[PDB]
Specification:
4 chains of a larger assembly, A mainly beta (about 325), B alpha/beta (about 220), C mainly alpha (about 300), D mainly alpha (about 55), A: about 325 residues, mainly beta, Methylamine Dehydrogenase, Chain H, 2 helices, 28 strands, globular, B: about 220 residues, alpha/beta, six-stranded mixed β-sheet, 6 helices, about 45% helix, about 15% strand, elongated, host-virus interaction (chain B), G-protein beta/gamma-subunit complex binding (chain B)
């Protein structure tokens, strides 16, 4: 009624400010730069240790160790350089949907349909890997978890709310109820002061770890968001959606700077990532292969087709040396 | 160079053998997906015989290791996590036969759920098992409440002999394909061993179909 | 009144087409199974069958050069030894692998519990070694005595001498007849009584269980089994019966006459060799997934 | 009505945010890329001498 009308008036007011702030297309500014994104990317390494579909993966700070989780029930930490399996952590629940790797490498997270963020410690006196803490406080399935420090973790579940957890404490010290749909992605800023989350309501909302507040909301999509990563600088981020279009938003302009759409693709976008410099964008699609888009010219730079199934999660190493990409074929491939 | 690398390679090979052994054990187990609008009905099936996210129920029947998943405890968007169960052997659908007059329309909600999962791209070749719950109460309830309360096009005598068949026929006609998926409808009984016997017989048929496709004789 | 020339032309054409299509199909199957597809029980069984048939097809030109030269063998004694043992190993392995695949299908259809519980990759690898060891043990007499004896006319032929030392031509003939007849009986038994009957029983049980339980929604499961059984029978049964007939009259055969029996043996051998090349066309290429993966890889 | 009231308060509270020019934001975004273009293994093909992957 009156309250709904006031919300509609506020919605009309905020969009007018964004339109007034906008003066020209962002791609038009970068139309005069030489496009050097045309590269040839091959299969440098192939990893085959999973007996089931891989749903998530994460890179390490040293860019030598990567984690991968599958539906078999095994969490494997791979040595990227030597291909050897450093660790193979069994999982109580085989139905997993996300996994995270600590910046210091001391901890590894795992979440799934059993809505428990089981965190395992890698550096332990015993040879075997034991469970450190089981964060069982969520209602829906965990969809994305990310490590800020060795003591705090942010996990996004399917119950429309995100939560900040502490391994030492074991309880949610911060809860984000601003979303309306099921949150399906997470991405931390380089300084870890703020993060954004993509939900099933086709909107991505910015959050603050220290405050717990929702600074701003982006609603530039008509389909549910499946992945998100911040720009290397941290002033921008890109969200991938099932409508085969992934868009890049800015923390200041707050609208669609670039739009990566092609008429020959209709498959839902599953993974989105940025390189070290952020000039080229790594995007994973549901057409059994991923693609590379120029983050400044909004054109597809190269085609990366080496997987026998759809991509689930792909990540770029911290140093930007090589990008690794998993898939449902139980094969993880590191490409440079 | 070859000193620490050999230890890492040996460690990788040693755990890989364990993964293969664990992978064989995982493939040995047969998986059964469960869901349905009848959240009360599924509890009776699980508790009929001896053996938080989702609940995994593991038991063995006639030298076959069954694995039973309780998904009705999950309340979220189905398409965002239903692809995880793409490799299940056979889905078990539990629906209450007496939910036709509940408002919550309850039977219509289950009908939509049944149609929504039969048309899923992840269950193209996954045959689903059907269980009709509260059969004993259903025959008593139809005497006082006609079955045509929620069915706009029902024309027949209100007796359990043909009313149950009509419900089974209606459910079996919700499939867009009738060759890859075979629905095994059963009438739940008070006997504990008879409830699980149908599951073993149904799973045996599904295993035969998977073996035939794997061997190429399909 | 003599159709020997037309029969020889037919045999040459059959050998050539067998070689080319078997080599091509077996190479494609080996590549797809080893690299494009993951290893499963049926996948590794088909890979083993493809290896066994591909080695035989690769060695087939060494029979082509012998047939073109007739009795004369223009290659070395060690090469003849290697060829005549590898071909026997390939044929025995192919027959035993067909029998093993039939038994595997029978145990998968009749006992789903057993194939769900115990039938895995490791058990498949363990059971695969069986047929190969059995073939090696049965062929051991071929390795022992297949020395390429020369001829008085000038043509040197690869044949079982059966005697390293020739005490007397009559004694050598008698020993050769005895060894040939016992080897023929053993070959006929172990290659037709066990394998063919096991295959027939397995496919009959599969057909009966798929008919008495209504597990077939189409004629394809029955048609494929009938086609493969008929192909195996038509390829091997005439060869086995002709070999048995030759074994019965081996004493008269070794004297020099009965050239008609020899040409019948040759044509039945060609027909049996045709199986080693038509095996991938039915056991592998018939599968929809196999064809789709082969198309995608190419 | 509590959820609706919170949404209305949230929308009005986030209005006071410092906007920046889109062209300036676009120039800032590309400024980082060109500054880090030299140290970009994905953009410039790194030689195999120092490439950890070969």
């Amino acid at each position: 009624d009156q309250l709904r009308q006031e919300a509609e008036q506020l919605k009309n007011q905020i969009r007018d400010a964004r339109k007034a702030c906008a003066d020209a297309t962002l791609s038009q500014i970068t139309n005069n730069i030489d496009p050097v994104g045309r590269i040839q990317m091959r299969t440098r390494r192939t990893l085959r240790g999973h007996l089931a579909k891989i749903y998530a993966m994460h890179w390490g700070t040293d860019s030598r160790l990567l984690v991968s989780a599958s539906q078999d029930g095994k969490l494997i930490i791979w040595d990227s350089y030597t291909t050897n399996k450093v660790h193979a952590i069994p999982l109580r629940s085989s139905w997993v949907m996300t996994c995270a790797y600590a910046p210091s490498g001391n901890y590894v997270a795992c979440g799934g349909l059993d809505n428990i963020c089981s965190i395992y410690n890698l550096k332990t006196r015993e040879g075997n890997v034991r469970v450190s803490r089981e964060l069982a406080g969520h209602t829906g399935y965990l969809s994305c978890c990310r490590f800020l420090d060795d003591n705090q973790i942010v996990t996004s579940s399917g119950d429309t709310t995100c939560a900040l957890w502490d391994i030492e404490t074991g309880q949610q010290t911060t809860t984000f109820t601003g979303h309306t749909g099921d949150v399906m992605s997470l991405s931390l800023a380089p300084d870890t002061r703020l993060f954004v989350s993509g939900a099933c309501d086709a909107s991505a909302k910015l959050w603050d770890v220290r405050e717990g507040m929702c600074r701003q909301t982006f609603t530039g999509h008509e389909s549910d968001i499946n992945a998100i990563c911040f720009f290397p600088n941290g002033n921008a981020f890109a969200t991938g959606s099932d409508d085969a279009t992934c868009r890049l938003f800015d923390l200041r302009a707050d609208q669609e700077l670039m739009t990566y759409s092609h008429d020959n693709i209709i498959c839902g976008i599953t993974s989105v990532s940025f390189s070290k410099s952020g000039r080229l964008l790594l995007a994973g699609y549901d057409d059994f292969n991923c693609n590379v888009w120029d983050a400044l010219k909004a054109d597809r730079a190269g085609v990366l087709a080496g997987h026998d199934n759809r991509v689930s999660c792909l990540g770029v190493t911290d140093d930007g040396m090589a990008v690794a990409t998993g898939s449902w074929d139980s094969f993880l491939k590191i490409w440079n | 160079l070859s000193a620490e690398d050999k230890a890492a390679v040996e460690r990788s090979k040693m755990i890989d053998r364990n993964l293969r052994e664990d992978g064989e054990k995982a493939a040995r187990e047969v998986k059964l997906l469960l869901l349905g609008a009848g959240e009360s009905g599924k509890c009776t099936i699980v508790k009929q015989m001896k053996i938080t996210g989702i609940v995994e129920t593991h038991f063995t029947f006639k030298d076959l290791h069954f694995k039973m998943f309780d998904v009705t405890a999950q309340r979220s968007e189905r398409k965002k996590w239903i692809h995880c169960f793409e490799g299940v052997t056979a889905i078990i659908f539990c629906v209450a036969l007496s939910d036709y007059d509940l408002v919550l329309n309850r039977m219509h909600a289950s009908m939509k759920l049944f149609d929504s999962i039969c048309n899923n791209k992840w269950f193209t070749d996954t045959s689903i098992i059907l269980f009709l719950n509260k059969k004993d109460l259903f025959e008593e309830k139809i005497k006082k409440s006609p079955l045509t309360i929620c069915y706009p096009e029902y024309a027949g005598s209100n007796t359990y002999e043909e009313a149950a068949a009509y419900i089974q026929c209606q459910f079996e006609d919700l499939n867009k394909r009738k060759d890859t998926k075979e629905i095994y409808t059963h009438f739940t009984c008070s006997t504990d061993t008879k409830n699980v016997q149908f599951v073993f017989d149904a799973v045996t048929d599904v295993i035969i179909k998977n073996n035939l496709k794997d061997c190429g004789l399909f | 009144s003599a159709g020997y020339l037309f029969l020889d032309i037919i045999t040459y054409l059959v050998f050539a087409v067998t070689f080319v299509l078997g080599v091509l199909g077996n190479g494609l199957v080996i590549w797809v199974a080893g690299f494009r597809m993951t290893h499963t029980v049926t996948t590794i069984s088909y890979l083993n069958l493809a290896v066994a048939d591909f080695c035989f097809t690769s060695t087939l030109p060494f029979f082509m050069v012998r047939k073109a030269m007739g009795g004369h063998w223009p290659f070395g004694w060690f090469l003849c030894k290697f060829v005549f043992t590898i071909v026997d190993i390939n044929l025995f392995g192919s027959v035993f692998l067909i029998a093993l695949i039939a038994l595997d299908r029978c145990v998968c259809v009749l006992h789903p519990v057993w194939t769900q519980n115990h039938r895995t990759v490791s058990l498949a690898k363990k059971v695969i070694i069986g047929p190969w060891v059995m073939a090696l043990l049965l062929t051991l007499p071929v390795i022992i005595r297949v020395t390429t004896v020369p001829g008085k006319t000038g043509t040197v032929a690869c044949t079982f001498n059966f005697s390293p030392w020739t005490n007397d031509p009559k004694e050598r003939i008698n020993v050769a007849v005895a060894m040939l007849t016992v080897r023929g009986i053993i070959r006929f038994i172990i290659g037709f009584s066990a394998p063919m009957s096991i295959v027939a029983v397995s496919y009959g049980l599969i057909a009966t269980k798929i008919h008495k339980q209504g597990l077939i929604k189409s004629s394809r499961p029955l048609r494929v089994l009938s086609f493969v059984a008929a192909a195996f029978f038509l390829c091997w049964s005439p060869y086995q019966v002709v070999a048995l007939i030759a074994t019965v009259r081996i004493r008269e055969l070794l004297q020099g006459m009965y050239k008609e029996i020899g040409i019948a043996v040759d044509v039945t051998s060609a027909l049996a060799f045709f199986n080693s090349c038509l095996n991938p066309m039915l056991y592998v290429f018939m599968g929809q997934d196999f064809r789709e993966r082969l198309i995608h890889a190419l | 009505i509590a959820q609706a009231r919170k949404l209305v308060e949230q929308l009005k509270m986030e209005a006071n945010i410092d906007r920046i020019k889109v062209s300036k934001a676009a120039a800032d975004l590309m400024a980082y890329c060109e500054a880090h273009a030299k140290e970009d293994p994905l953009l410039t093909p790194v030689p195999a001498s120092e490439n950890p992957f070969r």
